[PDB]
Structure formats: structure tokens, C-alpha cells
Structure 1
């Protein structure tokens, strides 16, 4: 009669080699592993967006509270949590004229409006950082709410993407500029109400999470590392491989695969997987032909050699589709004899809703259900006692894992993907269902698919999230 084995909650390092389990509390108690000297904020938008951003930044400077620190901890101030200084001075601001917005408004199809506005923001940023002597580590794009609302892809009065920030980061990728788009209603909800007379973007109780996420994104895009993983073996390389497909009309989507790589720290070195005009969208089974497979493997091995000087002893591959024999055979012979290759598939569509007899509490996060040596389940979502709440909503749903090829311990990959689920940077949540190698996967695929015209994307992460 089977049971559910337990996997311990993974730990994340912090300042002075300190080990915690929560990123927010660990940051508030210890801070980052490595310090940066200071950041300089740059903003593009109207003067209303400028004063809104200034008000929100000085509010962030103050220690702000929430309902209770058990679930949503209070913000102790950016200086006290990161050791870096944020100021409302030495800020570079570029204004966008609302008359140009009015001129661009009355166009017929919203796609060309999206294109011209995105290009205007792009070359405004390029002009701003190519003439101004003051260095800007992070540019803050304060998009207006009505631009996000009335210029939607299906709003009613080809490689370019209709999403604003997708095209923004895609065409800003070719100049190595860390940018972060800020929606106006997110940080101007005080004066923003709905038609009834209520803030539909309400943060009357929850703005501490907003401050936490914004602050950690600003520190991460600056260059400093907020937190890393605790235990990494000498010679293990994670390869979270993207298998997200776009629906790019009659243009051959084929395989828009990319790959994330974690080797020694939380550093991600994404190298662009090929578009690969083989296997036209009628053939979308993600079966990688051997030349591109060995090219991607060579990219991963060369990055590992550049960052580590030593040959890896084991390659961990994370994906979401089934793996065919010839792809793994191509993956095998390039790898040396000493190393090991194993592939893991993560999926959500498998239903398994574990309910509770008494009380109204969900499955505690960390339970592992083992069906066979190959197939297993991991409950990365649900209740966690450090939070005293559930990270999931209603009933949590697990991620069905399955090792295809190669010999490895199932609990080893279970705890390893559990550790990989803790490295979310864009949102400072405790954990997410999909691992961060798969969480960043869809977004970075959307970034790369919005600009075919690039050929060597930077392998950092500041220009993506």
C-alpha cells in the first residue's frame, strides 16, 4: 500500500553564507550575496508618469507595512534590505508628448500603432543612452494605462509581435540595456478607480508584495545577485529546454526551442536554439534533428567550459514533451564517456487532485508521489507552513515528472527540481508550480520570437524579465 514520500524544503543562500528558506525574509534579515555600489534609475513617459514614479519610489524608500508578516512580510526599505541606495535625484527622464499619442490614436489598425509607438520608445531609449553621460543601469518604461487598454491586439475602437513589452525587449536586445516596463495603474492605484467608484487594481492590503517584487527586480537587473542555490554538485549542469511553439501563420514555426542553463549558481546562460526550417508546422513534434541538437549541446558545453574550466559530470535536461530515440542518440555521442545525460519532462495537463478529509486545508507543498522508477509526481504547490498559507489556489495540482533515458535517482531529480522552483526573480513569490527554467522558458521564447532580425542575443537575463 503506497504512501507519499516527503522531500525537504530546499534552501537558498544569502549574505555572509547564511541559509534560509524564504527569499523575502532572508533578504530582510541578511541581504544579497554580492553588493553593488549603487543604481541610477532612468524613466521614459509623461511628466505625470514621472511624478507617479517619484511618489512610488519615495514610498518604497519608507518602510511600508501590510496586514501581517506571516504571509506577506513588510518592506524594511530598499537600503535596509539590499545595502544599495535608491534616490529621487540623479534620475534621467525623457518625456513623451501626449500630442503624438493623439496623432497615433486615430489610426485604423492598431498593429501599426503598436509598431510606431514601440519603435518610438525604442529609439527614444537608444538616443537617451547614446548621448547622456549619466549611466542608467535600469530604464523604467512607465506606459500609460489607456495605451495598454485601447491598443490591445484585439482592441476595437509579420514577425513583429503585437505585445508591447515583447517587442520592446526584442528590439532592445541588440544593445544590452536592462529595461523593465512598469504599468501605470500598478503604481498609481491610489488615484485609479473603476466606473463604479472602486479601484479594480486594488492594493489596499497587498502593496508590500508589489514593493518587494519591484525592489528585487530592480536589484537583479542592476547586476547584483539576490540569492543563489545552496548545494550544487561538482559537475552537474541543468538544461531547462524551451519547447513552446508560436502560431506564426504560414511562416515556418517548426521548432522555436531555446534553452536555459544553471551550472554553479543562479546564473542563466540562454543560447538561442535554432529556428530550424525543417519539419514545417504540420510536423510539430519537437523532434530535434541531430545537427541542431549537437550544436545546442556544444553551446552548453562551451558555456560550461568558459564558466567552469572543467568538464561536467552529469547533464540535467528539463523539457515538457516526449523525447524520441534519435534525438537522444544525437545527444549521446557528442557528450564524453565520463558524463551522464538524462532527460526530464514536466507537464501540467495530467490531472491529479488530492483532497483532504477534515478541515479546509490543501496538500502541504513538498509531497512526492512515486508511481514507478521512471514516472513520479511532485507537489510543488499547496500549503507551506513557513507561509502559513497555500501558494496554490483552491486545490493544488502537481507536475507529472518522468525520466526518459539514462540512469539516475528519482528522488535526486525530485529534490533538484524542487530547488530549481525557488529561483524566481521577476516575481518575489515563495515558489511557483513550473520550475524557473520552464517559467522563464515561455517568456524568453516570446521575446526571441518577436524579432527574427537578431542573430546573437545576449545570454544574460536582465534584458528579458
Structure 2
């Protein structure tokens, strides 16, 4: 009968120097860490997209409750929580009429259907910032509904609506992934919302019922949107509360290019996080990383140095010195030829360790009494380099679970290096709280690998880009 260890739920700090456990609760009590004071809203959409944006931005001053407030606390109001004021009449509008939609969207082929609509926003967004001197904190995009259904792969346009044929057959494509790519050489922050989200009351089915049932969850939506919006304007709402300073977390990303003849070409990415999670992302160059025989991705000793240094030296500028500890998170185990590329560039002082976080199917843990599963924080330590961690399960403050069944832990193996495992766990847990795009109690996967695939889908959508080190708020 082996026993597990409790990794105490680590805390995050807020304004006025006091820390709490839930990022939603403390925000109304204290507010964001560093506070900007003005957010001019830049709108890009139809006329209907305006009032839908106008009415909702008019409504987040008003509180909206959830169905079960005990499980997702209330929203007081923007001016009440964050201190910054967000006004409806403060709107900079660049219109893209529905008349431009039907011309550029009615194409037989999906790639030219997507690309031409992406073409329409890039000129109207870039030129709206160029000409007008108006400092727009974030530019908001109100994509109409009839585009989301029609601008992905595996969703062909009907044989009816077309108004321009494709000129050759088919012998990436997602919109918010593609639009985000051509705005990387222009460090301009964007947030994409559909009309289906803000105004779900209008768009119904045949039965007179809303297409997306938000009636129970209308309050929590004010948490997700109005938190992620404040960040891209330039203010980080919360650091992590307690940390040994001078520590680095690097998140590895590959992505196989399906369009290439070689089954090894992939666009690599390396995302670094520190205490704040604003972070920085350093793009790695393209090369053969997919080993189709063994199946796992691996790097070549050339790109690992050009990536760690281009990453680590930016830390020598972020803080005045070199890092003391660096932990490298990734999906696959590390072989030997790759690690000597890292150890060679790493300072002799700095200890370096690589960690394998896999969402595998190894164990469920059925609590022996009662209908509620085990509480988040239990962790089986099998050996001194491998351990099980329950990121999901029950949460005591919330009185509800995060997984709708018996939870599944994630498997953490220290493949390379040597380190006190219980210190990784107490740190990996703290990397769950940090997620700005949604204010939740915790994530299931640490934030270093959260947007692995969404970052990968940005780089491969445009190959000619030379993407420098950029903050994360330009990538989300």
C-alpha cells in the first residue's frame, strides 16, 4: 500500500502585495498587479457587429451572475475590479461591410476563400493604426457568424452561393490561426470574437431556442473575456506569489508540416516563461526533426544552440544576470545527442534539467468512499525522478470537480538532469494558475505547453516570415 504526497496549492499574489488562492476572488478584492488607466477599443466589423460589441461592452459595466455562483464567482464590473475604465463611446471603427464579405468569400476553394478574407482584415487593421495617431491599446475583431462556418478545412462552400470559381484544383487554413500570423511582423495585439458569442440571444435555431446555451454561464464569460482583454493592453494582472528568483522555464514546440514531401520538416518554437507568464517566444528555424521510424520529434545540435542563446541572452537583458536554474518542458523523452547541445551553451553555474509531461492513460484513482473523486494535489512518487500528479479532480474551495468523471493525472518524468522531484511538482502546480486568457482555478497541463499547438499553427501558416522574439500577447 503506497502512499502519496500532497503538493500544497501554491498561491498567486495580487495588487497591494496580498496573495490569495483564486484569481477570480482576489481580483474584486484587490485588483491587478500593475494597472494601466486607459483602454481605447479598436473595432473592425459590420454595422451589426458594432451594436453587438456596443451592447456587450455596455453590459460588462453591469454585473452578470452565473447559475452556480458557489462554483464560479460573480463579476462586479470592470471599473469596480481592475480600476481601468472601459467606455462604449470610446470606439475607433474601421468598417468591413457585408458587401465585401460576399465577394471575397464566395470561392470554390477553401484556401483562396480563407486567404482573401484574411487579406481584407490585414489592410484595414494595419492602415487603421498607421494613419490615425490614436493609441489603440488592443484591436478587437468582430467576425460575423457566416464566416466561421465557411472558412475552415473540411467545410466546403456550397455549390450555390459561389460568385467566382477556383482556377485550379487542390492538387494552414483556420482563420484566427492565419490572421494571427500576418500580424506578427507588425507587433499589433488582436482579439477575435464571433457574433455568436456576445449576442447569442439573436441567433436561434428552428425551435426558437438559442443555438449556444449560455443562460447558466453568462457571468463566467465576463471573467474570461474582460480579463484576457485587459492583458493585451499592457498590464499583467498577477504574478505568482512565492518563488525562488532567478529560475527559467522553457517550453518546447515542434509541428510536422503535412504539406512537405519529407516527413521530417517541422517549424520549431521555444516559449520561455518566468514568474509573470507574459513571457517571450523565440522562433526556432526549420529543419528535420520528425523521426518517422521511432515516431518522436528530436532536434539537431545546430538549432538547439541558436535557440537557447537567442532565448537565454534575452534573459541576460530581462534580468541583469544569467539564470541559475532552467527547466525544459516538452512532450517527448530526450535522447543523448540533443542534451550535449544544451549543456555546451549553458553556463557552468546553471543547473539544467529536462522534464517529460505526458497526458497518458496510466492511472485513475477511485476514492473508496463517496461520489466525489480525490482532491487536486495528491501525487504518487514512484521513484526519485518519475512521479504522478493530479492536476484534475476535486477542488476544496470550489466544492466542484474540474473533470466530469474520475480525473486523469499527468505523468512527469525527469528524463535528463537530476533534481529534487518534489520541487518540480510544487513548481509545476504553480504553472497551472498562470493563464491569462481564462481566469480559472487551475489548468490541467502547465502553461508552458498550453498553447503548444496554437503557436505551432501560427508559424507554419506563413513560411516567409522572419519572426523575432515576441511577447505572448501578440500570439494569443
Which stretch has the larger CA shift, 126-135 or 400-409? 126-135
Q: What's the RMSD between the two structures over aligned residues?
A: 2.3
Change (3 A) 1:232 1:72: same
The CA distance in 2 between the partners of 1:368 and 1:414, in whole Å, is 8
Which stretch has the larger CA shift, 38-47 or 188-197? 188-197
Match of 2:23 in 1: 23
Residues 176 and 458, structure 1, Cα contact 8 Å, conserved in 2: no
Match of 2:301 in 1: 290
1:133 to partner: Cα distance = 2.4
Change (3 A) 1:349 1:10: same
Q: Output one character per residue of 1:235-293: Cα deviation in whole Å (capped at 9) or x when no partner.
A: 32111212443433426653422112123433311100121246686786322111211
Residues 261 and 270, structure 1, Cα contact 8 Å, conserved in 2: yes
Q: Output one character per residue of 1:2-25: Cα deviation in whole Å (capped at 9) or x when no partner.
A: 111100001111001111111111
Q: Is residue 430 of structure 1 aligned with residue 441 of structure 2?
A: yes
Which stretch has the larger CA shift, 254-263 or 240-249? 240-249
The CA distance in 2 between the partners of 1:172 and 1:426, in whole Å, is 19
Residues 271 and 459, structure 1, Cα contact 8 Å, conserved in 2: yes
Residues 383 and 391, structure 1, Cα contact 8 Å, conserved in 2: yes
Q: Structure 2 length normalisation: TM-score?
A: 0.93
Change (3 A) 1:71 1:35: same
1:107 to partner: Cα distance = 1.7
Which stretch has the larger CA shift, 258-267 or 364-373? 258-267
Change (3 A) 1:251 1:326: closer
Q: Output one character per residue of 1:60-80: Cα deviation in whole Å (capped at 9) or x when no partner.
A: 111222224321111110111
Residues 254 and 283, structure 1, Cα contact 8 Å, conserved in 2: no
Q: Is residue 454 of structure 1 aligned with residue 430 of structure 2?
A: no
Unaligned segments of structure 2, at least 5 residues: 160-171
Q: Output one character per residue of 1:362-397: Cα deviation in whole Å (capped at 9) or x when no partner.
A: 221111111111211100111101111111222211
Residues 236 and 276, structure 2, Cα contact 8 Å, conserved in 1: no
Which stretch has the larger CA shift, 216-225 or 230-239? 230-239
The CA distance in 2 between the partners of 1:298 and 1:264, in whole Å, is 20
Q: Structure 1 length normalisation: TM-score?
A: 0.95
Which stretch has the larger CA shift, 135-144 or 246-255? 246-255
Match of 1:328 in 2: 339
Q: Is residue 213 of structure 1 aligned with residue 224 of structure 2?
A: yes
1:456 to partner: Cα distance = 2.8
The CA distance in 1 between the partners of 2:390 and 2:255, in whole Å, is 23
Residues 432 and 447, structure 2, Cα contact 8 Å, conserved in 1: yes
1:212 to partner: Cα distance = 0.7
Residues 13 and 228, structure 1, Cα contact 8 Å, conserved in 2: yes
Change (3 A) 1:158 1:126: farther
The CA distance in 2 between the partners of 1:410 and 1:41, in whole Å, is 46
Change (3 A) 1:451 1:74: same
How many residues are treated as equivalent by the alignment?
A: 464
Residues 106 and 157, structure 2, Cα contact 8 Å, conserved in 1: no
Residues 14 and 27, structure 1, Cα contact 8 Å, conserved in 2: yes
The CA distance in 2 between the partners of 1:231 and 1:442, in whole Å, is 29
Residues 254 and 280, structure 1, Cα contact 8 Å, conserved in 2: no
1:300 to partner: Cα distance = 2.5
Residues 254 and 281, structure 1, Cα contact 8 Å, conserved in 2: no
The CA distance in 1 between the partners of 2:123 and 2:294, in whole Å, is 38
Q: Output one character per residue of 1:338-357: Cα deviation in whole Å (capped at 9) or x when no partner.
A: 11010001111233121223
Residues 433 and 441, structure 2, Cα contact 8 Å, conserved in 1: yes
Match of 1:193 in 2: 204
Which stretch has the larger CA shift, 51-60 or 349-358? 349-358
Which stretch has the larger CA shift, 251-260 or 15-24? 251-260
1:90 to partner: Cα distance = 2.5
Residues 272 and 457, structure 1, Cα contact 8 Å, conserved in 2: yes
Change (3 A) 1:456 1:55: same
Residues 173 and 458, structure 1, Cα contact 8 Å, conserved in 2: no
Unaligned segments of structure 1, at least 5 residues: none
The CA distance in 1 between the partners of 2:469 and 2:374, in whole Å, is 40
Q: Output one character per residue of 1:394-436: Cα deviation in whole Å (capped at 9) or x when no partner.
A: 2211110000121211100001110001111112222111111
1:175 to partner: Cα distance = 0.7
1:145 to partner: Cα distance = 0.9
Change (3 A) 1:262 1:50: same
